[PDB]
């Protein structure tokens, strides 16, 4: 098993980090955030109906895009940087062009066809984007035409999480039914399926190598599944913390495993050995979102207190 | 700072001013959760957004921030103040939410 092999591995030690930055330009709960590939600009959705582009180094506000619907659950930042996206209880996904000639920000396209709300969305290119919905399915899109190209039905309950592979060829997503399924973008078939949890899966992320993923459930548990052994390798639970898990994220090497809870904290777990090494406590209310840069330099953490901090 | 960083800071300050203006504009808005069909109605210099809505996790995930829940937070019936009533209904909702807002302000200022 994993524990037997990892017994001889030396531990990590206590993890201490502080709020280097505090970004204060929102007035309601923050539900999502996403880093730019440069790991300097980041976008934030809030229930105030606003979407602010942040200069992380100076705390400068680069853009402030107003939204038609204030009920938003998702952000996205195109890898090129020219487009952001967002979705929520409008059941549509809006795309914004950040680099126009008139000097403003305009909506490029609105995507319609999903029957249920939008849970997550992540660009694959400037023209491709995969979204998740409460219809128990997902889809691929063409933003130059606005029509779906694929559909990935088969789940029983609502899909609440989504995680593109590093190559964006494979795709795993969790559902209200406690199972995660591996989807192929270019074939539209469920390659693998996984089980083991007992509650709705709220967050899912991909290991930096693409051979595994982490499933954070609403019953205070996480598990490390694999795409070759096709079974869980570890658990992450503690009797002191019995609540939901609201976010999950690895680090640049996969040796550390961030997380978020309804207990106003972000317990810094460990991957190889389940022993918990670290805690972050700097938020008045619970933490919705949790992201780690591409260069592993910082960890942004938005929360229901309308502030988001940078921890290093 | 250089001549361009200062201009960027000026732009950031202008964005801050506009965000403050928009926030002050939205301080006269109320979300009357009802428990999709959305009824917006104004009354006595105050707007109301009523939302009509199968799972307990859905309600907690996106509606815990509402002001005063109305069932035909606080309770309006037709910390957790409960009010009952049966042209007069709108005024009753107005009074209930005004009380809720005043109590929330007092809680914010620590006097509660």
């Amino acid at each position: 098993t994993l524990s037997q092999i990892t017994n001889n591995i030396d531990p990590v030690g206590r993890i201490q980090m502080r709020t280097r930055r505090t970004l204060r330009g929102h007035l309601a709960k923050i539900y999502a955030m996403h880093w730019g590939t440069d790991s300097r600009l980041l976008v934030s959705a809030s229930q105030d109906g606003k979407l602010i582009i942040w200069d992380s180094y100076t705390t400068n506000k680069v853009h402030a895009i107003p939204l038609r619907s204030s009920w938003v659950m998702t952000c996205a930042y195109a890898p090129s940087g020219n487009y952001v996206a967002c979705g929520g209880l409008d059941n549509i996904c809006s795309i914004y062009n950040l680099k126009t000639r008139e000097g403003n920000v305009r909506v490029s396209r609105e995507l319609a066809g999903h029957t249920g709300y939008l849970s997550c969305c992540r660009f694959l290119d400037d023209n491709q984007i995969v979204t998740s919905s409460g219809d128990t399915t997902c889809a691929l899109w063409d933003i130059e035409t606005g029509q779906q190209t694929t559909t990935f039905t088969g789940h029983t309950g609502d899909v609440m999480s989504l995680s593109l592979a590093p190559d964006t060829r494979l795709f795993v997503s969790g559902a209200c039914d406690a199972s995660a399924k591996l989807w192929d973008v270019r074939e539209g078939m469920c390659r693998q399926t996984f089980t083991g949890h007992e509650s709705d899966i709220n967050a899912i992320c991909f290991f930096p190598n693409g051979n595994a993923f982490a499933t954070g459930s609403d019953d205070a548990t996480c598990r490390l599944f694999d795409l070759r052994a096709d079974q869980e390798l570890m658990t992450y639970s503690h009797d002191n913390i019995i609540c939901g898990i609201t976010s999950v994220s690895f680090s640049k090497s996969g040796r550390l495993l961030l997380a978020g809870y309804d207990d106003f904290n972000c317990n810094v777990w460990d991957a190889l050995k389940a022993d918990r090494a670290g805690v972050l406590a700097g938020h008045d209310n619970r933490v919705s979102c949790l992201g780690v840069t591409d260069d592993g330099m910082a960890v942004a953490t938005g929360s229901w207190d309308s502030f988001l901090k940078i921890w290093n | 700072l250089s001549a361009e960083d200062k201009a960027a800071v000026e732009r950031s300050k202008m964005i801050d001013r506009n965000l403050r203006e928009d926030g002050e504009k939205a301080a006269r808005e109320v979300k009357l959760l009802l428990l999709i069909v959305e009824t917006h109605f104004t009354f006595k210099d105050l707007h109301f957004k009523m939302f009509d809505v199968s799972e307990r996790k859905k309600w907690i995930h996106c509606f815990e921030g509402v002001t005063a829940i109305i069932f035909c937070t606080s309770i309006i019936l037709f910390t957790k103040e409960i009010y009952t009533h049966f042209t007069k209904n709108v005024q009753f909702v107005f009074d209930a939410v005004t009380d809720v807002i005043i109590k929330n302000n007092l809680k914010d200022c620590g006097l509660f």
Partner: single-chain antibody, 231 residues
């Protein structure tokens, strides 16, 4: 996007004049505006500047006091009120726009000037101003600053412009490395502090004109002498 100026003409010495510019096709209030003039036989010379929201104004040390700059946002108009004119102010005046955030390109669009006739500082050198050119050939322009334009945050502020005969200048490269939109990929720029160059791969048609280099680090903005290419 259009920028067109009015006014100008012939004015006796000591008589006040007013120049105006109208803007259409973009968000006027989100851009800073500049005035730039050039004598009939000399190069460009920055005159005055007003920021977005009118919260900051700058003037040259040769027209300070006499001139004034102001903008009307609802009417999308920029004004230049000038008094006590002299023979030193006989030049064609251009209007330029600039927007400043992380990653933007200032000095994008130039207007069409209006001719006016009347009856400490960073210095740069572009003494090379006559070089023969041949089609399908590569030439390198030079530009040197008195002090180091590189800043602590990693940005070096050197801008390149090209003025085709009978037209207004256009932006080629901003901050010494980034290529402007609509500019062919054969234009390249490089060079450490106080030593900069511009590179062109193929010298085809429409690449002939006068090239200038400008610095944006200290608010008095100084242009180079200019480099002219001929067939």
């Amino acid at each position: 996007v259009q920028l067109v100026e009015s006014g100008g003409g012939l004015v006796q010495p000591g008589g006040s004049r007013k120049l105006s510019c109208s803007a259409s096709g973009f968000a006027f209030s989100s851009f800073g505006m500049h005035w730039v003039r050039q004598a009939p036989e000399k190069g460009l010379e920055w005159v005055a500047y007003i920021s977005s929201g009118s919260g900051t104004i700058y003037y040259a040390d040769t027209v300070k006091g006499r001139f004034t700059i102001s903008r009307d946002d609802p009417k999308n108009t920029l004004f230049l009120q000038m008094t006590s004119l002299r023979s030193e102010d006989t030049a064609m005046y251009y209007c330029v726009r600039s927007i400043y955030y992380y990653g933007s390109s200032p000095f994008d669009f130039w207007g069409q000037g209006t001719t006016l006739t009347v009856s400490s500082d960073i210095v740069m050198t572009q003494a090379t101003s006559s070089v023969p050119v041949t089609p399908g050939e590569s030439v390198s322009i030079s530009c040197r600053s008195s002090k180091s334009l590189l800043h602590s945050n990693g940005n070096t502020y050197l801008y390149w412009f090209l003025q085709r005969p009978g037209q207004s200048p256009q932006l080629l490269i901003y901050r010494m490395s980034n290529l402007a939109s609509g500019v062919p990929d054969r234009f390249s720029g490089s060079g450490s502090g106080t030593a900069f160059t511009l590179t062109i791969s193929r010298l085809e048609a429409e690449d002939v004109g006068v090239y200038y280099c400008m610095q944006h680090l200290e608010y008095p903005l100084t242009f180079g002498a200019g480099t002219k290419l001929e067939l």
